Amino acid sequence: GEAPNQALLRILKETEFKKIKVLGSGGTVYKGLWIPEGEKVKIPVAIKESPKANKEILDEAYVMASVDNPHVCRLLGICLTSTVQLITQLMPFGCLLDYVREHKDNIGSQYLLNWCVQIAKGMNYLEDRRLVHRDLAARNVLVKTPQHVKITDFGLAKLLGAEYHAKVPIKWMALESILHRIYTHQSDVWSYGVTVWELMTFGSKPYDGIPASEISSILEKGERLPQPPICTIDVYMIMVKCWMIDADSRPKFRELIIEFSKMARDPQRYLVIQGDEDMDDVVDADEYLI
Ligand SMILES: *CCC(=O)Nc1cc(Nc2nccc(-n3cc(CN(C)C)c(-c4ccccc4)n3)n2)c(OC)cc1N1CCOCC1
């Protein structure tokens, strides 16, 4: 027996939004203000604006409405206009992949290790809610402040019952997923390892210049992503443990929290980086609880 999902799905009027600029297209992601009726608050939001693709975006809203954790992006509501719109909290600093790329020369060890802690906390929460993400990557981690990141993009996420089978991001998937289309929380751990490598290399592309069709044979021969320059063996060994063939001998998200937490207490024993060492009624969504 599975527990009843008593999450609320907030349907928001279209007149409650004063959508401002466009953030980025691909669909489209807007930014704007959400002003609930006569609540005297202005909440900065992001809005994601024809066919059966409506089914997918609503499957996304189902997952996002059913999560509540400081390191997971939650759905504020949907607007049922001509198009189905997803309304989420504005993450004003962008995605973490763009952030580490545009700020390499100003990111210290404490920030890198804290992000690894927070991402592991969010993933451990998803595991607690029996959620396999299947698209964990630096591009899908958003930055509320440089000290606070959250996981987003649940378009591939699936709810395990009391391994899931099935276009996918090859250079982030465990071998068993590339080969057998098998996805578990431990295959998420593999993607976590690639995501940490992304941060540790300040946004390098994993297997840059290697066709995705070759990834399965490369991983089978025993090859893995190289040790990033700033990484001590301690940190790189954690990433290598995420890439083991035996999925059960990979670290659990609850262990990665612990390990990175200890390292974040002495961040330079583990990362070697040169240089280390309107408004008025605006309320962040994390402070608007209903
Ligand atoms: C890495 C790409 C990116 O997201 N850039 C970005 C993000 C944000 N802030 C933001 N706030 C709330 C929600 C989002 N957001 C972005 C995305 C796109 N994916 C890749 C993360 C989604 C999304 C959610 C679910 C399903 C599909 C997509 N939600 N982003 C920015 O606001 C400041 C600005 C930017 N970029 C700035 C630099 O140029 C590119 C855009």
Phi, then psi, of 111 in degrees rounded to 5: -70, -45
- What tokens appear for 160 in the block? 């395990």
Is the C-beta atom of 46 inside 6 A of ligand 1?
Answer: yes
Instruction: Tell how far the Cα of 195 is from the centroid of ligand 1, in angstroms.
Output: 17
Is 21 assigned a ligand-binding role in the annotation?
no
3 state SS of 158: strand
Q: CA of 186: how far to CAs of 192, 201, 245, 256, in Å?
A: 9, 23, 11, 12
- What tokens appear for 41 in the block? 């608050």
- 280 catalytically annotated: no
Q: Give the residue among 171, 173, 138 at the shortest CA–CA distance from 153.
A: 138
Best residue among 47, 141, 142, 150 to mutate for probing ligand 1's pocket (most ligand atoms within 8 Å of CB) is 142
Helices (H) and strands (E) in the chain, counts: 8, 9
CB within 8 Å of 33: residues ≥ 6 apart:
17, 18, 19, 20, 42, 43, 44, 45
Is the C-beta atom of 92 inside 6 A of ligand 1?
Answer: yes
- CA 2-176-165 angle, to 5 degrees, is 40
Is 152 assigned a ligand-binding role in the annotation?
no
Is the C-beta atom of 16 inside 6 A of ligand 1?
Answer: no
Count of C-beta atoms within a 10 Å radius of residue 168: 14
Instruction: Give every strand in the sheet of 22-25, ordered side by side.
Output: 22-25, 28-34, 43-48, 84-89, 75-80
Residue nearest to atom 27 of ligand 1 (CA): 153
The single residue listed with the structure tokens 């402070």 is 287
DSSP states of 168-235:
--GGGS-HHHHHH--B-HHHHHHHHHHHHHHHHTTSPPTTTT--GGGHHHHHHHT--PPPPTTB-HHH
Instruction: Tell how far the Cα of 199 is from the centroid of ligand 1, in angstroms.
Output: 17
Phi, then psi, of 164 in degrees rounded to 5: -105, 145
Solved by what technique? X-ray
- What tokens appear for 256 in the block? 């990665």
Instruction: Tell how far the Cα of 20 is from the centroid of ligand 1, in angstroms.
Output: 15
Q: Judge whether 149 and 286 are in contact, CB under 8 Å.
A: no
Is the C-beta atom of 94 inside 6 A of ligand 1?
Answer: yes
Is the C-beta atom of 152 inside 6 A of ligand 1?
Answer: yes
Q: Are strands 148-151 and 141-145 parallel, antiparallel or unpaired?
A: antiparallel
Q: How far apart are CA 15 and CA 238, in angstroms?
A: 49
Phi, then psi, of 225 in degrees rounded to 5: -65, 145
Torsion of CA 109, 113, 119, 124, to 10 degrees: 180
Catalytically annotated residue among 68, 128, 135, 278: 135
Instruction: Tell how far the Cα of 143 is from the centroid of ligand 1, in angstroms.
Output: 9
Is the C-beta atom of 65 inside 6 A of ligand 1?
Answer: no
